[PDB]
Amino acid sequence: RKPPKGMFLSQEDVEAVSANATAATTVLRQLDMELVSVKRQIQNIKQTNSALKEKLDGGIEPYRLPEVIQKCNARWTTEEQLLAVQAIRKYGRDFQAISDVIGNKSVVQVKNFFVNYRRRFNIDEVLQEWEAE
Amino acid sequence: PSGVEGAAFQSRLPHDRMTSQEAACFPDIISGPQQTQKVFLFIRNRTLQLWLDNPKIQLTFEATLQQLEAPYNSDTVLVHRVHSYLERHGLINFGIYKRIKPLPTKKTGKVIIIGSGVSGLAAARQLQSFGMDVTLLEARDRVGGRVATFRKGNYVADLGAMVVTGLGGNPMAVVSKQVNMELAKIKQKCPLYEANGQAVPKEKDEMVEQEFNRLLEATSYLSHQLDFNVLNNKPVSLGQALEVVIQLQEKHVKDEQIEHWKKIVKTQEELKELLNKMVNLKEKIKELHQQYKEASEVKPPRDITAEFLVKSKHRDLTALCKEYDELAETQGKLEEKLQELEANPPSDVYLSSRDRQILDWHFANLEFANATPLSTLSLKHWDQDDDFEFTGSHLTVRNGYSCVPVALAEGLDIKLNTAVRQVRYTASGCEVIAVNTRSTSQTFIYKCDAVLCTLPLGVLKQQPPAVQFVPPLPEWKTSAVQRMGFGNLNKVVLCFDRVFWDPSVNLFGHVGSTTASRGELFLFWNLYKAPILLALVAGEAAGIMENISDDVIVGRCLAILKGIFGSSAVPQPKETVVSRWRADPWARGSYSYVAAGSSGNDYDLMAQPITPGPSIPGAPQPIPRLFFAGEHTIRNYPATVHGALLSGLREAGRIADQFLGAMYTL
Numbered sequence: 001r002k003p004p005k006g007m008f009l010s011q012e013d014v015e016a017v018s019a020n021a022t023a024a025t026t027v028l029r030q031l032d033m034e035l036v037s038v039k040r041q042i043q044n045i046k047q048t049n050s051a052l053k054e055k056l057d058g059g060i061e062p063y064r065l066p067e068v069i070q071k072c073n074a075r076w077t078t079e080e081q082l083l084a085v086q087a088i089r090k091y092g093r094d095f096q097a098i099s100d101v102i103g104n105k106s107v108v109q110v111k112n113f114f115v116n117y118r119r120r121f122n123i124d125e126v127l128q129e130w131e132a133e
Numbered sequence: 134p135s136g137v138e139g140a141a142f143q144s145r146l147p148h149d150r151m152t153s154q155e156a157a158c159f160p161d162i163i164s165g166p167q168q169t170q171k172v173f174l175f176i177r178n179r180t181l182q183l184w185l186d187n188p189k190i191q192l193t194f195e196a197t198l199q200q201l202e203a204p205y206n207s208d209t210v211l212v213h214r215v216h217s218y219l220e221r222h223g224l225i226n227f228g229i230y231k232r233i234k235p236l237p238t239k240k241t242g243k244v245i246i247i248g249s250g251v252s253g254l255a256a257a258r259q260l261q262s263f264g265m266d267v268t269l270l271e272a273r274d275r276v277g278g279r280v281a282t283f284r285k286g287n288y289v290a291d292l293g294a295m296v297v298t299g300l301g302g303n304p305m306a307v308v309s310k311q312v313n314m315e316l317a318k319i320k321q322k323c324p325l326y327e328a329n330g331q332a333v334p335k336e337k338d339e340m341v342e343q344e345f346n347r348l349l350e351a352t353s354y355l356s357h358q359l360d361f362n363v364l365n366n367k368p369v370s371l372g373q374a375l376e377v378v379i380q381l382q383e384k385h386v387k388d389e390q391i392e393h394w395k396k397i398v399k400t401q402e403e404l405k406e407l408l409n410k411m412v413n414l415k416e417k418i419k420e421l422h423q424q425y426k427e428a429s430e431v432k433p434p435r436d437i438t439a440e441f442l443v444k445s446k447h448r449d450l451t452a453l454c455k456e457y458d459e460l461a462e463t464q465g466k467l468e469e470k471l472q473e474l475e476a477n478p479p480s481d482v483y484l485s486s487r488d489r490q491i492l493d494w495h496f497a498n499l500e501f502a503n504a505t506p507l508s509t510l511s512l513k514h515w516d517q518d519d520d521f522e523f524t525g526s527h528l529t530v531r532n533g534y535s536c537v538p539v540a541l542a543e544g545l546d547i548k549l550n551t552a553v554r555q556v557r558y559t560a561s562g563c564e565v566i567a568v569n570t571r572s573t574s575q576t577f578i579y580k581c582d583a584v585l586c587t588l589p590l591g592v593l594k595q596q597p598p599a600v601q602f603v604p605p606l607p608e609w610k611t612s613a614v615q616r617m618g619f620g621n622l623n624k625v626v627l628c629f630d631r632v633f634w635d636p637s638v639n640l641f642g643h644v645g646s647t648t649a650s651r652g653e654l655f656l657f658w659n660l661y662k663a664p665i666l667l668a669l670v671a672g673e674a675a676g677i678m679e680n681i682s683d684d685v686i687v688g689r690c691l692a693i694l695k696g697i698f699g700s701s702a703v704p705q706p707k708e709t710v711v712s713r714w715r716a717d718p719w720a721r722g723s724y725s726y727v728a729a730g731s732s733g734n735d736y737d738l739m740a741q742p743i744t745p746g747p748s749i750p751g752a753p754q755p756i757p758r759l760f761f762a763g764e765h766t767i768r769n770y771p772a773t774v775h776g777a778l779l780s781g782l783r784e785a786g787r788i789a790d791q792f793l794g795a796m797y798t799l
Contacts, residue, residue, distance in 0.1 A: 001358070002354075003350075003351055003354050003358075004347050004350045004351055004354070006347065007347060007348075007350075007351045007354075007378070007381075007382065008381055008382065008384075008385035009351060009354060009355060009359070009378065009381055011359060013381050013384070013385075014355070014359065014361060014377060014381065017377050017380050017381060017384065018361075018364060018377060024376075024377075024380045027380075027384060028380070028383060028384060028387065031384065031387035031388065031391060032387065034387075034391055035387065035390055035391055035394065038391065038394045038395055038398055039394060041398055042394065042397060042398055042401065045398065045401050045402055045404075045405050046401060048405055049401065049404050049405050049408055052405070052408035052409060052411075052412055053408060055412045055415075056408065056411055056412055056415055056461075059415075059461070060414075060415060060418050060454055060457050060458075063415075063418050063419065063422045063450070063454070064454055065425070065447060065450060065451065065454075068447075079437065079440075082437040082441070083437065083440065083441050083444060086437070086438065086441045086445075087441070087445075090441075090445060097448055097452070100448040100451070101441070101444045101445055101447075101448050102444075103444065
């Protein structure tokens with residue numbers, strides 16, 4: 001019913017090795033080369049990737065800044081307000097960035113800000129111009 | 134099996150069905166009631182059982198009805214009919230028995246038998262057993278034909294048939310009780326030895342071998358499951374398919390190397406696009422950090438815009454620093470996936486030189502127990518006789534298989550050194566024309582009612598004809614002769630003065646330099662008590678080692694033995710015998726194979742007896758004058774002694790039916 005397991009005999013396979021006298025020796029060169037071809041393209045990209053691996057020498061570690069583990073407050077200091085209004089002009093709705101810029105305002109205090117103050121800080125005008133951009 | 138049923142199987146008949154032959158003799162029973170069939174079927178089995186349980190004396194009808202018990206020893210013609218049918222077609226009282234009823238007073242009808250080979254002798258005995266004038270014509274100075282034993286001093290070695298496929302339903306089992314043969318078993322263990330001189334280690338021995346049995350089935354799947362059976366309007370040979378299977382394997386070894394190194398690239402090229410994304414983040418980060426530094430050099434107190442600049446560039450540089458960490462977290466997982474795929478690299482080869490050279494020896498063994506290059510065996514039919522093989526360990530005859538033809542020949546009119554030269558058969562009889570082999574001038578004419586021809590298929594194949602048929606053999610029979618396979622394999626007999634081989638080892642191989650000489654001296658037997666090693670030569674090689682002197686051949690043998698047992702430990706042979714079966718004009722080969730284009734059904738034509746045209750035109754259609762038996766004639770047991778023997782018993786049973794009449798069918 002089925003070939004002895006480990007033997008590959010497909011209907012399609014068979015007609016290709018019997019289509020003529022050397023259709024056997026044909027098919028096993030367009031494979032034999034096929035390989036040498038992919039084998040080449042390996043050592044190429046294995047090299048392209050060896051040079052890219054060395055440009056990343058050092059990694060990003062003469063470039064890190066330590067952690068601002070600053071405790072999340074409640075009041076909107078007249079300073080923190082102003083950092084916010086620019087945070088919107090530069091960041092729009094990313095509510096995460098705004099809350100990392102101000103540092104001591106949870107993302108949700110950033111909502112109340114967006115609404116409580118809006119009009120007084122024209123958060124509409126400010127936001128629409130972030131979109132031009 | 135065992136019982137009444139044990140006989141039925143040891144006699145090659147199904148204990149619970151009427152056979153197509155028995156239907157034709159007892160067509161009252163088989164058309165009638167299930168009861169009577171079972172009655173009959175016991176009486177058959179029961180009588181078979183008696184003959185088998187004592188095959189050294191004839192089983193008279195009286196003796197049988199005696200040991201029958203009712204309701205079966207009730208109908209004393211159903212017992213008669215059964216017995217006579219059995220006795221007629223050699224299912225009982227065949228071989229060598231003491232005859233309780235000594236031979237008939239006067240002979241009836243005259244039969245000339247061409248060939249005292251085994252089939253000949255077996256029918257001659259059965260015909261003379263039935264009271265006919267049987268005389269056998271033999272071109273040789275000995276009986277047996279293909280059963281040749283060499284004897285010099287204490288040395289004994291068959292150049293002929295040697296093995297006895299197991300006595301599980303073998304008529305030879307019956308014979309061996311009747312003739313004192315020394316049946317030793319064949320201890321199947323065979324160590325192989327490459328052209329160096331050293332054994333192939335179990336390791337390979339078994340993984341080659343299994344790949345070889347695996348390739349075979351694969352062809353059988355090509356044949357029966359896919360119908361790979363014609364290749365540009367020629368039929369497909371076994372050796373053909375055995376390479377379109379070996380190629381499809383070498384091919385898939387490559388398809389699989391390919392789609393694995395193709396897994397590597399498809400991921401190594403993901404690394405190429407992650408390393409590029411990483412280096413262009415180390416560039417954005419290298420530069421933000423510079424910006425952020427510049428924004429902190431502003432010495433405070435600063436206004437809010439230049440304070441939002443620090444706080445901003447800080448989140449921007451922490452955001453990019455997060456990206457670049459993730460994107461070398463991912464560089465982590467891929468960079469090891471890729472020693473992963475370089476550490477399960479699928480197989481380098483299908484087979485090595487050392488590999489498909491040992492496999493070449495496992496092909497030279499097919500070329501031995503088929504006697505032909507696998508490129509000529511029919512794919513669909515090569516093995517068609519397998520379904521019928523006798524259950525038992527194969528055996529060897531230690532006193533020489535020739536003990537069995539000689540035993541049969543006894544009591545028979547045998548004209549030795551008599552080359553039959555022309556068979557003439559007509560509406561009213563036949564005459565056979567022979568010469569004396571020694572002075573070929575001296576001519577012999579033999580007249581008879583029927584000629585049984587056991588001429589080896591190789592002889593029948595000769596162009597131009599060793600034996601002329603008058604009238605010619607009809608096309609349906611001549612074409613069945615061309616289509617069928619006749620093959621070759623030869624034996625070299627090495628007689629020494631001391632065993633220098635492993636004496637518990639019956640046989641040991643030798644692997645071949647080439648593909649093209651997988652046959653040449655590919656296997657050795659220590660089968661005999663004496664120091665006699667016996668060297669097979671099958672395959673394509675057999676046919677060409679007949680063009681090489683006996684010396685050159687013993688040389689090639691000793692060399693192959695020196696390498697395997699030590700340049701010094703292998704003396705000279707005292708006596709050497711090189712067979713030449715394709716040479717030998719009374720055989721023109723060794724036995725039949727099923728050629729590509731033959732089926733097993735040519736083997737059945739081979740037997741259809743020949744009926745000549747009417748003498749006086751518009752006469753009654755005559756009684757059939759020319760008959761055939763021999764190894765080539767028996768579909769289900771070709772190329773064997775038991776098979777020839779069986780064909781002899783057969784034709785005798787049919788000739789007797791033709792000329793003595795068939796009383797057992799009312």
